[PDB]
């Protein structure tokens, strides 16, 4: 396959990018959610659907030429071997520290339980606070409630999921929005195919 391969996350990202994609002459032929590789109206573009945390991995290694993934994933995964061309202002949220409702931080050293391990260490380093970090792959709302960690680091838009599990947002780490990333080789080699699509997206924004 000599054209572009686009890396995409199922659900929230796919849906919020399709208006930019349609405007760039890229419409998927089937609906992803309706039951791995997808064609598009442009024959020189195709789409890969994966978990949002694997988008940077597929892009940096070049198994996809470019992709859309949240800045939460790029910060956590490290975006060393990709180019971050465009802030797409879609799928917006924030990385925040969260704890149990109104309970104060305990006397002893803080335990943070989180997916975002490197984000946590980096943040709490910037706030001069020494912590123990515990890696979770699954949903993290449970961790405070059984004292696995005192706080967590997670994405929050409204905070309904946080309140629904008896938690509350505490500190604002940074803002989050999905970004357009491009494999470093693919940007040099296939720029001719990329330039229009980048211009459409950029116009759309």
């Amino acid at each position: 396959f000599l054209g572009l391969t686009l890396a995409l996350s199922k659900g929230r990202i796919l849906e919020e990018t399709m208006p930019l994609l349609r405007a760039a002459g890229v419409e998927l032929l089937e609906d992803p959610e309706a039951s791995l590789i997808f064609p598009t109206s442009n024959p020189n573009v195709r789409v890969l659907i994966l978990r949002a945390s694997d988008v940077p991995t597929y892009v940096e290694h070049g198994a996809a030429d470019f992709g859309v993934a949240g800045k939460d994933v790029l910060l956590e995964h490290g975006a060393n071997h990709v180019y971050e061309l465009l802030d797409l202002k879609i799928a917006q949220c924030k990385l925040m520290t969260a704890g149990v409702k109104d309970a104060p931080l305990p006397n002893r050293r803080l335990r943070i339980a989180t997916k975002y391990v490197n984000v946590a260490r980096a943040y709490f380093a910037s706030q001069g606070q020494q912590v123990d970090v515990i890696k979770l792959y699954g949903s993290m709302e449970l961790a405070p409630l059984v004292g696995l960690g005192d706080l967590i680091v997670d994405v929050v838009d409204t905070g309904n999921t946080l309140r629904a599990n008896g938690l509350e947002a505490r500190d604002h780490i940074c803002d989050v929005s999905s970004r357009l990333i491009v494999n470093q080789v693919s940007y040099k080699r296939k720029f001719a195919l990329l330039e229009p699509i980048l211009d459409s997206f950029k116009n759309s924004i």
Binding site: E84, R179, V185, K188
Partner: protein
């Protein structure tokens, strides 16, 4: 995984192939008039890392000369050694050098990179003219074309002079540049546009990352103050872009924000990528009151994309050989000697069961005549 990361044996046919490539390419360079030089694996650090960048220093293993108690290093790049050689023997005129040799790195260059590459390269000293950079481009592409690869080399040009002159004519902080450079390396454009809104001339620095690829119009997008050394640099880049397309039919891309080797590169830079691989196969550029320019490549990375003719691996029959008398053995050896000169791989069996790997032919006796037949 019994060997350190980025350290691998190259064995058997791959090893033969590597020898062949290394030798063919080395001789190609010699016939283009580049003097071969073979500097040692180790030197005192004083000489080895003179003018060395911080990345080079960190890549270079250190060891102790027990005879003097001084620091030595196992080289990570030969290029500085060629400088040293040319300092002593080069003279004021034009000098050409080629080299092939192992180098060692402390850490991999990027994703799954080798730490024990077989560095092969060429260099021209004493010529200011862009014509020297064209020669090396021609020499290189003759070498690549000789390999009969299906693999496609894509080439990327840059020019560190451009960003050097902006940083000088914007009076930049040591930290600021290091920020800009890290941002460029990551092509984090959103954050680049942010950090530029505060920094002096920062429009210009953002235009580099945003409209670098378009070398035709790049100068027109820069400030009035910007629009001498910057002006030559954009012309240089345009000349090489053309020469590669015309003379070699090469797909070229521009990126003036390629600033790997900001310390040693004194101008134009060249980065060749093989197929879709992240580490460039070839790395060349202008460096350094003596002019200098040249490239290098890891020969070992050509192994995947190059293929030799199948070899003729011949076995003599044990029994038939031993039945011969002294004089017949001499004649057979004279015949087998002839075959070896033709490049056939002939094994003289120690035992009946002695079997070479990849056996293609037998040399067998029939009615007082030795002949080859396939298995």
């Amino acid at each position: 995984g019994m060997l350190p990361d980025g350290v691998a044996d190259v064995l058997f046919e791959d090893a033969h192939k590597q020898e062949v490539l290394r030798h063919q390419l080395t001789q190609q360079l010699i016939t283009h008039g580049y003097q071969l030089v073979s500097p040692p694996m180790i030197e005192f650090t004083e000489s080895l890392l003179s003018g060395a960048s911080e990345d080079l220093k960190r890549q270079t293993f250190k060891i102790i000369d027990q005879l003097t108690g001084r620091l030595m290093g196992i080289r990570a790049d030969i290029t500085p050694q060629i400088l040293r050689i040319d300092a002593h023997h080069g003279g004021d005129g034009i000098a050409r050098y080629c080299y092939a040799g192992d180098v060692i790195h402390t850490l991999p260059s990027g994703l799954f990179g080798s730490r024990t590459p077989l560095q092969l390269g060429a260099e021209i000293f004493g010529c200011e003219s862009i014509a020297a950079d064209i020669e090396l481009i021609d020499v290189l592409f003759s070498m690549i074309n000789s390999l009969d690869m299906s693999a496609v080399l894509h080439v990327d040009l840059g020019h560190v002079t451009i960003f050097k002159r902006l940083a000088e004519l914007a009076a930049l902080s040591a930290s600021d540049t290091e920020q800009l450079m890290q941002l460029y390396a990551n092509k984090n454009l959103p954050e680049l546009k942010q950090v530029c809104q505060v920094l002096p001339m920062g429009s210009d620095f953002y235009t580099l990352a945003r409209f670098g690829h378009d070398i035709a119009n790049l100068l027109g997008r820069l400030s009035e103050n910007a629009q001498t050394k910057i002006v030559t640099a954009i012309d240089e880049l345009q000349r090489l872009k053309a020469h590669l397309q015309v003379q070699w039919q090469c797909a070229v891309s521009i990126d003036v924000t390629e600033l790997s080797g900001y310390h040693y590169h004194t101008g134009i830079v060249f980065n060749g990528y093989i197929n879709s691989e992240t580490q460039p196969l070839v790395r060349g550029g202008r460096f350094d009151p003596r002019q200098a320019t040249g490239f290098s490549m890891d020969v070992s990375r050509l192994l995947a994309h190059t293929q030799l003719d199948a070899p003729f691996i011949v076995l003599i029959d044990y029994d038939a050989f031993n039945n011969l008398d002294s004089a017949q053995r001499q004649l057979l050896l004279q015949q087998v000697a002839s075959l070896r000169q033709q490049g056939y791989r002939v094994t003289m069996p120690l035992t009946a069961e002695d079997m070479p790997v990849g056996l293609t032919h037998r040399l067998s006796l029939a009615d007082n005549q030795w002949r080859l037949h396939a298995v």
